[PDB]
Structures are given as structure tokens and as C-alpha cells.
Design an enzyme around this catalytic site. Structure first.
Site, PDB file in Angstrom:
ATOM      1  N   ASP A  57       0.832  -1.198   0.000  1.00 11.74           N
ATOM      2  CA  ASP A  57       0.000   0.000   0.000  1.00 11.74           C
ATOM      3  C   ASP A  57       0.871   1.254   0.000  1.00 11.74           C
ATOM      4  O   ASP A  57       2.086   1.173  -0.186  1.00 11.74           O
ATOM      5  CB  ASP A  57      -0.921  -0.008   1.233  1.00 11.74           C
ATOM      6  N   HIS A 359       1.539  -9.203  -3.196  1.00 15.61           N
ATOM      7  CA  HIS A 359       0.411  -8.297  -2.959  1.00 15.61           C
ATOM      8  C   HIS A 359       1.040  -6.913  -2.825  1.00 15.61           C
ATOM      9  O   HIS A 359       1.202  -6.383  -1.721  1.00 15.61           O
ATOM     10  CB  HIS A 359      -0.295  -8.683  -1.659  1.00 15.61           C
ATOM     11  N   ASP A 403       1.480 -19.079  -5.279  1.00 13.67           N
ATOM     12  CA  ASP A 403       1.703 -17.684  -5.653  1.00 13.67           C
ATOM     13  C   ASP A 403       0.354 -17.077  -6.051  1.00 13.67           C
ATOM     14  O   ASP A 403      -0.176 -17.369  -7.121  1.00 13.67           O
ATOM     15  CB  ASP A 403       2.695 -17.665  -6.815  1.00 13.67           C
ATOM     16  N   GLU A 412       2.036 -11.296   1.137  1.00 18.80           N
ATOM     17  CA  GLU A 412       2.203  -9.955   1.668  1.00 18.80           C
ATOM     18  C   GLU A 412       3.711  -9.681   1.708  1.00 18.80           C
ATOM     19  O   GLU A 412       4.516 -10.605   1.867  1.00 18.80           O
ATOM     20  CB  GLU A 412       1.621  -9.884   3.085  1.00 18.80           C
TER      21      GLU A 412
END
Ligand SMILES: [Ca+2]
Length: 433
Positions: A57, A359, A403, A412
Site C-alpha cells: 500500500d 500483494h 503464488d 504480503e
């Protein structure tokens, strides 16, 4: 088989370059990343640009960011030879400074500290390149009315550790780092409280379990950086008052227990601290749950991060003269598992069949002007950019792994995930492994 720890160390530094927020330098190596979050600011418009995006993020979470800085600086201090041998000393220092330059901006007043830029929901509702963000990025702070002993304490520790790193290379910066470190510790110690109770947005992302360990952690680091006995006395006084010797061992963004103990063992040479470190390590090597293939399984979240953190504590314990050979060997098995001894690499951009769909937003994006949005997240293809050096969450308790970009458990990646890992790599290089 036969891993080049020096190159993995270099790769880890590339991961940190990929996490950089703000204006990027002319010598940036991860060039697909662009200037972003150039409007990050405080209540009065204070400049808050820079620092590291936390994970996949674009929120700047101060607690884990400070922890990351402290651990990276720690490895640079104790295993500088590892960075030098890998020809990465300058970059190692830059990685620490990217964080500390930001902590200095966030320290807007002696007893005021900005602990976050960007809101969890607003930030996470967006999937794309950071330079394309258009949503408001609120900045949250702690002050005398809304304390944050854990956040201020960890930041003080990071600043103090960084002051040591720069003592000779940049004495002026070192002095500045220390001034801020001293003030932040006083703020943390004089105004007790959990930062997540003030910066409530963080309570659902990086809630603090206890701030007492950070106070001891900070005092210990300040003693190391100043040689001022007052800090040692405070560190040991609080250690006893809070009864840390009885706390559950471990080292991570939330708990500094094992770090505090191995650090105090080194600074005081006292047997008591060494006993606590030994019992913890012996427990991990001989009893802690492990996957069938040998990986320490401490928790489902950031599994590899936990194993690598443990590996680092073992390497630091070995430096104390505690079962050096066996401790170093076991630490190596954990790092080697992450590198591929479990069947595949769990470090993006490295080794055999590594994760290719972390991610992570910025790495998933094609270059502009092509649109990057949730359709990109939804792509069956691997992330457009290889996120060199990123340590993912990892396999399950049975060494199983797939994956998957949507899997924010196993795929993550985060700045704290690579901290203990990177410092452990520096140690392995320093040891000539
Ligand atoms: Ca804590």
C-alpha cells in the site's frame, strides 16, 4: 544450493528502494518507481514528504517504519563488514537515512510527532501507481494530550541507532539525529500511552500491544549512542520495574523483548540478560513448532519475517559468545529456507521459482501512460515489475504455498518483513558464509 548472501543483501536494498515515498534521487536504481506523495504534510502544512510506504500500500505507518529503521541500523553497526564486503555500505546507510530524514520532518515540535500519513481505507481502496493517487492523505500525530510511548520510543531508538551509523561519515547529521532522539525519548517517557489509542486509524493495522518494552529499548539505544550512564540506569530500572525478564521472547515491530535483552547483555555484560537470551534461543531451536522442512513457524502472519527475526536474534546471541557455532548454523537454516532450501525461493526476483505475484501495487503496474487500476490487480499474469529482494509471508505450517496476488497472508510484503532478514544477511556475509 550455495547462496550468494552478498547479492541477496543487495536485492533486499532494492526492495527498500521500491518502498521509497517522496522525491526519488538521481541515483535511484529501481527506476520504474517515480516521485510520489509529494503533498504529504502536517496540520500546519509542515513538509512530511519522504519515508517508506509500509507494504503493498502507500500508507506511511510510523511504528513499523521506525522499527525497520532501528533494525537496519542495528545490522549496519554490528555487521558493517557484511555491507562492505557486498559493496553495499553506502546503500545500507542511505536506506537508514531515507527513514530518519523522514522522522526528523515528522518531529514537528519537541513533544509532537506525526506517526502516519495516508488513511487506511482511502489508501487501500486504490490500486495503482503511487504517483497517480488523488485521494486525501491525512496526517495523524501524537502529542502531550495524545501520547505514544511506543511510537516515540521506537523512533528515538531508530534515531539513536542511526546517530551511531553516521558518527564518522557525517558528524553533523549524527549530532542532529541524536538531538531528536533525546527529545523523543523524553516525550515517550514523560507522556505514557499507546500510540494506537491516539492515532486510532492505526489500531486496525499496527495496534501496539504494550509500550513498556519500547521505553527500555529506547533508553538502551540512547545509552549506546551517548555513553551517558543516565540512560543505562533508566533502561535497567525500567527493565526491572516492567519485569521484562518474564515477558515472552521475540523480536518484531510490536515486541522488542529479545532485542532489549541481547542489546543490554552486550552493553552491560551482565549474565542475567545472557541467561534470558539463551533460554529463548534454545527454546526456538529445540522446541518451537517448525514445518516438516525445518522452518520455524511462529505465526501465520509474516511467517518468514518471524523466522528471519529469530535468526537475527540468534546471530546477535552468537556474538555474545553463546553457542556461536550452533546458533549461527540454525540462523542460517532459516535464511536458507527463505532463499530456497524448502523447495522454492520466497524472495521475489531471486532463486528458483520465486513468488511473482506479491500483494504489491506499484510493482504490479505497467508503465504510464497505460492505466493501472483494479483490473491490473485482477490480472492472471505475474506482477509487471519484478520486486527484487522482497520477502513474502511464505508457506503454511506444512510447507505448502501458492503464488497468489490476492493472498495477503502468504504474498504480503512489507518493510518490517525485510528488516531482520536484511540484517541477518549482513551478518552471514560478515561471518564469511
Ligand atoms: Ca511493544
Amino acid at each position: 544450493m550455495a547462496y550468494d548472501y552478498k547479492q541477496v543483501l543487495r536485492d533486499s536494498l532494492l526492495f527498500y528502494e521500491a518502498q521509497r515515498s517522496g522525491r526519488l534521487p538521481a541515483d535511484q536504481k529501481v527506476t520504474w518507481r517515480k516521485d510520489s506523495a509529494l503533498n504529504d504534510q502536517g496540520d500546519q502544512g509542515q513538509d512530511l514528504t519522504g519515508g517508506y510506504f509500509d507494504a503493498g500500500d502507500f500508507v506511511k505507518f510510523g511504528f513499523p517504519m521506525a522499527y525497520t529503521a532501528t533494525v537496519l541500523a542495528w545490522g549496519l553497526i554490528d555487521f558493517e563488514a557484511g555491507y562492505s564486503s557486498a559493496g553495499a555500505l553506502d546503500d545500507g546507510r542511505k536506506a537508514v537515512k531515507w527513514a530518519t530524514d523522514y522522522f526528523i520532518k515528522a518531529h514537528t515540535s519537541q513533544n509532537e510527532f506525526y506517526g502516519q500519513v495516508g488513511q487506511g481505507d482511502a489508501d487501500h481502496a486504490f490500486w495503482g501507481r503511487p504517483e497517480d493517487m488523488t485521494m486525501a492523505r491525512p496526517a495523524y500525530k501524537i502529542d502531550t494530550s495524545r501520547p505514544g510511548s511506543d511510537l516515540a520510543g521506537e523512533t528515538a531508538a531508530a534515531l539513536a541507532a542511526a546517530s551511531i551509523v553516521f558518527r564518522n561519515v557525517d558528524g553533523t547529521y549524527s549530532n542532529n539525529l541524536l538531538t531528536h532522539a533525546r527529545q523523543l525519548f523524553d516525550f515517550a517517557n514523560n507522556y505514557r500511552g499507546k500510540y494506537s489509542d491516539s492515532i486510532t486509524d492505526a489500531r486496525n493495522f499496527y495496534a501496539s500491544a504494550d509500550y513498556r518494552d519500547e521505553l527500555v529499548w529506547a533508553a538502551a539505544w540512547l545509552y549506546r549512542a551517548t555513553n551517558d550512564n543516565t540512560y543505562l540506569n533508566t533502561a535497567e530500572s525500567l527493565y526491572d520495574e516492567f519485569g521484562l525478564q518474564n515477558w515472552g521472547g521475540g523480536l518484531n515491530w510490536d515486541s522488542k523483548v529479545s532485542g532489549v535483552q541481547v542489546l543490554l547483555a552486550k552493553l552491560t555484560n551482565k549474565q542475567a540478560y545472557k541467561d534470558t537470551v539463551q533460554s529463548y534461543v534454545n527454546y526456538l531451536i529445540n522446541n518451537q513448532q517448525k514445518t516438516p522442512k525445518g522452518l520455524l513457524y511462529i505465526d501465520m502472519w509474516g511467517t518468514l519475517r518471524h523466522a528471519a527475526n529469530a535468526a537475527f536474534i540468534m546471530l546477535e546471541a552468537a556474538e555474545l559468545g553463546l553457542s556461536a557455532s550452533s546458533y549461527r548454523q540454525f540462523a542460517q537454516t532459516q535464511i536458507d529456507y527463505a532463499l530456497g532450501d524448502g523447495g522454492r525461493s520466497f524472495v521475489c526476483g531471486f532463486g528458483s521459482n520465486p513468488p511473482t505475484r506479491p500483494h504489491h501495487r506499484s510493482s504490479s503496474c505497467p508503465p504510464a501512460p497505460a492505466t493501472c487500476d483494479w483490473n491490473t490487480f485482477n490480472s492472471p499474469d505475474p506482477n509487471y515489475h519484478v520486486l527484487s529482494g522482497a520477502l513474502v509471508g511464505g508457506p503454511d505450517q506444512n510447507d505448502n504455498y501458492v503464488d497468489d496476488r490476492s493472498d495477503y497472508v502468504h504474498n504480503e510484503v512489507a518493510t518490517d518483513y525485510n528488516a531482520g532478514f536484511q540484517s541477518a544477511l549482513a551478518a552471514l556475509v560478515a561471518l564469511g558464509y
